Every structure is written in structure tokens, then in C-alpha cells.
């Protein structure tokens, strides 16, 4: 993740990456990937259907489309 250049985004797909899922009470499992990396959109399901993941990618692109880059600098 650190080796991924800016701009960069993280999609958390699935209960395990969201909050550890079915293995939440295990001795070897991180209870959600957002203890490790920041997360931009969370997709529910185990597994999320192919379309549910597409819906989360459509959320992230809708977030890009409302992201203010050059008008942000113009406010500072």
C-alpha cells in the first residue's frame, strides 16, 4: 500500500477485510484491514456479489467526481 503512488484509494471488500468477519475471534486475524490502512469505501457481504463490488467502485468514482482538487488549493 505504501508503494502505491498518489492519488491512491483503498476499497475494503468483504466482512473479513471490514471487521474480521467469521474469523473475528481468532488469534491470527486482523479485525478489519482499517487497523492497517485507511479505507475509502466498504462493501458488505461474504462474499459481496460481483455487482455489489461494482456498486462500491461506482461509489468511489462518485467520490472522485466530487473531489475538489484545483478548487481546493484555491481555498488553500
Amino acid at each position: 500500500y505504501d508503494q502505491m503512488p498518489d492519488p491512491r484509494w483503498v476499497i475494503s471488500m468483504g466482512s473479513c477485510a471490514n471487521g474480521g468477519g467469521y474469523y473475528h475471534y481468532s488469534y491470527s486475524v486482523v479485525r478489519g484491514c482499517d487497523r492497517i490502512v485507511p479505507v475509502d469505501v466498504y462493501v458488505p457481504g461474504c462474499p459481496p456479489t460481483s455487482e455489489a463490488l461494482m456498486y462500491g467502485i461506482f461509489q468511489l468514482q462518485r467520490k472522485m467526481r466530487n473531489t475538489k482538487i484545483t478548487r481546493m488549493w484555491y481555498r488553500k
Partner: protein, 337 residues
Amino acid sequence: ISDIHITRTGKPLIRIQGGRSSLGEHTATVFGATGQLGRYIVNRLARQGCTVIVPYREEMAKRHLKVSGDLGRVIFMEFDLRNTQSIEESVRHSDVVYNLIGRDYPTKNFSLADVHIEGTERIVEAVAKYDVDRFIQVSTYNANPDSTCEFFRTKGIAEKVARHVFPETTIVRPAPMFGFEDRLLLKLASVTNLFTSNHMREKFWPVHVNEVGEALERMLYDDSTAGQTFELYGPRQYSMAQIAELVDREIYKKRRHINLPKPILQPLAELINRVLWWDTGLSRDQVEREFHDQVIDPTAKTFKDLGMEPTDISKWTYHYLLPYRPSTYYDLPPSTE
């Protein structure tokens, strides 16, 4: 330090200590936390189970902060300095307000006076308006209302404004800071910082940013620190030349600088800052600070008053400069010369 904290308004806080799942009982607001210092205070408060409001401007640059705390712990509020409502909405659930908002250089919508005086004015007036217990405002070293450097003057007037409005202000004056992503060690290892007005001979007592975030955490717990003034400086005095010597010994690169006469460089620096959109390190006042020297104003509390003993910058050069060693010298051990 205990399991019971009692605040200035008198509310008790029954705490469960360890971990990000526990109860730190403190609701903080940290203005200017997306900078360099701001993460260390936020991580310290959040990983001990405290609710932290993080007023932000640009959405994508705040994201590293959420990892610090558990679910519902780090709350992001989108604000502007000239949006008083968003300021008031951000401090009114809080028992401590950290003001870390500053900028070295003027911008097309903020002068140094506008971001320091007026920004502190709104933040402190909301602290007064909602009766927040603690207010730790971070000024700079050499802050003086009688100063002539815009940075040291404007951050010196905001100091007096804060006390005049909220007398229990803990005023904190750090020295130039070093750390990961610091604008001290990483600039001396960079290649853009080639221009210079003095011969890098100005002196200061550099302080670890990690030990300053720890110091701000301890001021929240040591209630007696309220209404005080703290200068947080390092164990030794160095010049920019002595620091740059350490950097070269560590990265194994032998950086070089182009010196300019101040009546020549300062006008240019005011042009680069006015014609480029990014932080260029160069501006009329940053050249003026470049010719100034740090003075530790007495009658001001120190790290020792927090019971802390800062470490020297030399011990930290290997850790933070290793990404900048060339491949040939990278596998070598720390210089420890």
C-alpha cells in the same frame, strides 16, 4: 496518570487505560492536525481511547488519521477558519482544544497575520463561548509582539489574544522540529534547497516532534499546566551548518548550497511564493527568520516540568535519513560518529 481525572469545570472522568478499545474519557478537538505535528498528538489521544475531532480542509489528506483510533473515535469535521459555525460545531463537545494551525508563508487568501491572529481569535472565542476546560495553543519559538519577522510577531500577538480571552491557556513554544516528514532533516537531505541568504549559521535547539506530541499529551493530564507557557526545545544548540553536517555524514551525499545576499534573495523569494502554488520553502519572511537566532525565553516551563528529557537530533539521523542513502552506502550501519 490515574484512573480518575477531574477537569477544570469539575466533571470527573473514570478511565479504563489501555488499548484502542478502552475509555480515555477525554473529548479533544485538534485544529491543524493534518500537518506534521498533528498526527502525533492525535495518535497519542486516539490509541488510548479518546474521542478526537479533526477539523479538516482537504478530504484526501486527512485519511491517515483514522487508522489511529477505533470505530467512532476519530470524528472528521469539515471546517474553514472564516466559517465560525464550523469552528463552534467542532469545539463544543470538548474538554480540550488544541490549536496547531499555522503557516510559514503567506497565501493569496491568508496573510501570516490572518491565519495566526484571526484564526486564533475565532478558535479562542469559541473556546470561551462554550466553556471548554483546556486550551493548548501552539505558538512558535521567538514569538514576540514586538518582533519584526512576520512569523515571530503574529504568533506572538495571538499568544496575547488567547490569554486575554481565555486566561487558562497553556501556551506552547516548540523549537524547530525534526522527525519523520520533518521540514528540517528532509530539506537538508533534499536537492531543491539550494538557495540561502546566511551561510546556514543560524542557531537553534532542535526538538524531536515525537517528544512534542508526548509533551502535549502530558499537558492534558497535568491540569496544573493550565495558564502556563512552555518552551519545548532540545538538549543542544546547533547551527544549520552543524545539522547539515550530520545529514551529509548519514546520507553520504555531501549536499551543497548557493548563498545569496539577502537584499537580492528576499525579493526573489517573495516572487516565487507569489507565483507558485506549492510550498517552495522560499518567502520574504522565511529569509528574515533565516537571519534570526533562537532565544529560550526564561520564566517559561520546559520538558523537565513535564518530567521529560529530550533526546539529541544526532541519535535520530540514521532512522529518518536512511531512505536517502545511495544504494552503495545503504547497507551500512548507523554513522554513530
